[PDB]
């Protein structure tokens, strides 16, 4: 459980400790640490540190437009379409690893993302027009 401890465990047990996975990835790699410094290792270190933040910030930009700036688990007001999966409540959470589930939505994973921005943020932050001051 020190890192990816529940990679093979159930999606429910993996959902119990998903903080750990998030903590190590951005921070990890110990990047922090003749006269030249133009060596082949330093240039592989810098670009490896650039995608470090540019893959982190690629994901953190998505949660910000979903109301999840500082939450590891948002429940979003987007209804689930039956075409994406036909399995019941306890059918997936007590049976599949997150690995199996990632390939089962990888086909229509982009369709979900586009709809998440519309109802949870594009409309929700607008619904306060009549409720902010009245």
């Amino acid at each position, epitope marked *: 459980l020190g890192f990816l401890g529940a990679a093979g465990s*159930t999606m429910g047990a993996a959902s119990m400790t998903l903080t750990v996975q998030a903590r190590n990835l951005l921070s990890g790699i110990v990047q922090q640490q003749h006269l030249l410094k133009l060596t082949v290792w330093g240039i592989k270190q810098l670009q490896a540190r650039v995608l470090a933040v540019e893959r982190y910030l690629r994901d953190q930009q998505l949660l910000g437009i979903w109301g999840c700036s500082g939450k590891l688990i948002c429940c979003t007001n987007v209804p689930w379409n039956s075409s994406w999966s036909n399995r019941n409540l306890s059918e997936i959470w*007590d*049976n599949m690893t997150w*690995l*199996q589930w990632d390939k089962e939505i990888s086909n229509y994973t982009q369709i979900i993302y586009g709809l998440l921005e519309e109802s949870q943020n594009q409309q929700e932050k607008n619904e306060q027009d009549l409720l902010a001051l009245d």
Partner: nanobody
Amino acid sequence: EGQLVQSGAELKKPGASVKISCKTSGYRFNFYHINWIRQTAGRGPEWMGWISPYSGDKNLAPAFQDRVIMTTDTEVPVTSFTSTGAAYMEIRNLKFDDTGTYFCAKGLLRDGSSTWLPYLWGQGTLLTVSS
């Protein structure tokens, strides 16, 4: 979604001791439990004992824990999510009351609320304990 198939068609004398086997395919053999049941000439089929292919911690029936004991070897992984394994069981004593058809079945789910109950069943084995 994983087909389970039994050996089938083994029969011996009443005071004998035979083992039955079950070929697994199409499901990860590590965590799905295996259990066994039997239907007699009597109307009601009864449950035997459930085995876990990992850890081996098992809770067999109290009326058969003294005579019947079953083990199960490891598995050979086909892919990351499909694998094929085997489960055996040995019974020491039996009579004409122990004759009938025997099934094995895949464990329901790999979680907490309920796992021990079967799910997918095999084609089954029928055993005649007629002398």
